[PDB]
Amino acid sequence: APSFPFSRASGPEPPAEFAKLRATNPVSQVKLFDGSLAWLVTKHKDVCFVATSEKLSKVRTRQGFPELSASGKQAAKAKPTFVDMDPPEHMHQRSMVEPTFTPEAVKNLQPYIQRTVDDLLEQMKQKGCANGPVDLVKEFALPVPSYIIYTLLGVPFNDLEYLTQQNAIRTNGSSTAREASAANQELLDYLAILVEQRLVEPKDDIISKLCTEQVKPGNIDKSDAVQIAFLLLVAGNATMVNMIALGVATLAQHPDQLAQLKANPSLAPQFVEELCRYHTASALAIKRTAKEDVMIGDKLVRANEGIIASNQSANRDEEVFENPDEFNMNRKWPPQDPLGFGFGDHRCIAEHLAKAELTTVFSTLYQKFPDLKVAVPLGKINYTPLNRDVGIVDLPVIF
Ligand code: HEM
């Protein structure tokens, strides 16, 4: 059994293993860091099955849950939020914060998302490129999703800049285990004081909604409000940052695609759909443990055995997406949906928000900076380490 996670074939490419497994052994065993053996499913068909089956569990306390790292094994001991719950506890807690993320709620947030993007672009323009390109990640990719989520949670405007750097420190590569931990409790501590304020003086934000609708009536404890809020902050922020930078690099890599977008910003949604398919920036989140014997393909996964469903592999499934390894915003989509945001009940709560932010960024960026270009040779782009999810650390640009 090969050790998993697999290493990306290269900077922007998924692991070379998926393609061969998909063709020769769709459902197979891999070995985790601690010697454990888990099942790895690679076909779109099987990934959807794993993501919806009632015979599979997301509870991390269950022996056999596929933890990918030592640190991950230690994080499993904390009190769970809906992300690690099975029905009916899952939807019961998830429905408490879901209203802000529905398609219509997100449609009403468009004017705000647009202004945030416009303001950040202007700030970046107000420092030019005086014999010095700017890092698109620090100046734009990072602030955009951070300010938005922080603002929705309830953080006052003047605190956004500092809190944005703190959250970034948690997931930063050059961060010690000490500074990452200090950043965590810093964010948690701030969220606690915020919940106290919103209990006294509630307002229009996710925390006030929790306090007024769930905390006060005794539905959940204050610590729970802190947990869910913290979950909403850390769950997909690092991912959004990478998706934005990955989108810019991809347009740099296919000038023909960029030309079409510049000529018609209306193509943004299609570009985003292909981007979330082609670059599956969150590839290790669909994991389960079998509650009972279940047959997947020709294999039979026994009770208490772990399963990892690769949505990244599923998104390159030749059986579903014709010419999967080709990035094409003009591609004709099949009836089966891409799995960039997961599938089933645990499908990303912020999928519509994530897409709205990306569409806003990509329908505005090149209208503001028509001549925007990566300042370093494409082969020199600083991608995240090959054994981690796909992303970009920094991205030098001139405009
Ligand atoms: C483009 C960026 C994003 C990508 C590609 C992404 C991807 C995913 C994926 C693959 C899952 C796993 C779902 C499953 O188990 O099937 C997920 C879950 C989740 N995401 Fe995102 N996500 C993104 C942004 C966000 C943002 C911005 C937030 C926060 C507002 C967020 C919050 C969550 C939460 C809380 C869950 C767990 C939902 C549940 O278990 O019911 N995600 N996301």
CB 53 within 8 A of CB 294: yes
Q: How far apart are CA 42 and CA 45, in angstroms?
A: 9
| Binding site membership of 136 for ligand 1 (Cβ less than 6 Å) | no
38 strand-pairing partners: 30
- Tokens found for residue 234: 């850390």
Burial of 151 (0-12, 13-18, 19+ CB in 10 A): middle
Q: How far apart are CA 28 and CA 20, in angstroms?
A: 12
- Tokens found for residue 263: 């000529």
- CA dihedral (64, 306, 62, 215) in degrees, to 10, reads 150
CB 62 within 8 A of CB 289: yes
Residues 6+ apart with CB under 8 A from 259: none
Q: How far from the centroid of its chain's Cα atoms is residue 362's Cα?
A: 18
Residues 6+ apart with CB under 8 A from 66: 32, 36, 38, 287, 288, 289, 306, 307, 308
Give the domain CATH number at 81.
1.10.630.10
Collapsed DSSP state (helix, strand, coil) of residue 394: strand
289 strand-pairing partners: 57, 306
CB 8 within 8 A of CB 390: yes
Indicate which residue's Cα is closest to atom 20 of ligand 1.
348
Q: How far apart are CA 285 and CA 303, in angstroms?
A: 20
Collapsed DSSP state (helix, strand, coil) of residue 302: coil
Collapsed DSSP state (helix, strand, coil) of residue 271: helix
Q: Which of 107, 117, 112, 105 is nearest to 362 (CA)?
A: 117
Write down the experimental method used for this entry.
X-ray
- Residue 189, H or E segment: helix 177-200
User: Judging by DSSP bridges, how do beta strands 56-57 and 382-383 pair with one another?
Assistant: unpaired
Whether the CA torsion 54, 58, 60, 64 is positive or negative: it is positive
Full domain range(s) for residue 267 = 1-399
Q: How far apart are CA 53 and CA 192, in angstroms?
A: 36
Catalytic residue among 46, 86, 317, 389: 389
Q: How far from the centroid of its chain's Cα atoms is residue 231's Cα?
A: 12
Compute φ and ψ for 215, nearest 5 degrees: -75, -55
Beta strands in the chain (DSSP E): 8-10, 13-15, 27-31, 37-41, 56-57, 134-135, 287-290, 306-309, 373-374, 382-383, 392-394, 396-398
Question: In angstroms, how far apart are the furthest CA atoms of the chain?
Answer: 63
Neighbour tally for 178: CB within 10 Å: 8
User: Judging by DSSP bridges, how do beta strands 37-41 and 306-309 pair with one another?
Assistant: parallel
Helical axes 143-153 vs 351-362, angle rounded to 10°:
140
287 strand-pairing partners: 308
**Total structural domains within the chain:** 1
Q: How far apart are CA 237 and CA 234, in angstroms?
A: 6
Q: How far from the centroid of its chain's Cα atoms is residue 105's Cα?
A: 20
Q: How far apart are CA 26 and CA 42, in angstroms?
A: 5
Q: How far apart are CA 280 and CA 239, in angstroms?
A: 10
Neighbour tally for 156: CB within 10 Å: 11
Q: How far apart are CA 285 and CA 269, in angstroms?
A: 24
Q: How far apart are CA 82 and CA 93, in angstroms?
A: 6
Please check if 211 is assigned to a binding site: no
Indicate which residue's Cα is closest to atom 7 of ligand 1.
341
Indicate which residue's Cα is closest to atom 16 of ligand 1.
342
Strand ranges of the sheet holding 287-290, from the earlier edge strand across to the other edge? 27-31, 37-41, 306-309, 287-290, 56-57
Burial of 65 (0-12, 13-18, 19+ CB in 10 A): buried
> How much distance in Å is there from the Cα of 317 to the middle of ligand 1?
21
> How much distance in Å is there from the Cα of 347 to the middle of ligand 1?
7
Q: How far apart are CA 316 and CA 22, in angstroms?
A: 10
Secondary structure of 37-90 as H, E, C letters:
EEEEECCHHHHHHHHHCCCEECCCCCCCCCCCCHHHHHHCCCCCCHHHCCCCHH
- Overall resolution, Å: 2.0
Active-site residue 223, yes or no? no
The atom number, within ligand 1, closest to the CA of 239 reads: 2
Indicate which residue's Cα is closest to atom 28 of ligand 1.
236
Burial of 18 (0-12, 13-18, 19+ CB in 10 A): buried
CB 134 within 8 A of CB 124: yes
Would you put residue 323 in left (φ > 0), alpha (ψ -120 to 50) or beta?
left
Q: With b meaning 16 or more CB within 10 Å and e meaning fewer, what string describes 361-370?
A: bbbbbbeeee
Q: How far apart are CA 271 and CA 361, in angstroms?
A: 11
Active-site residue 389, yes or no? yes
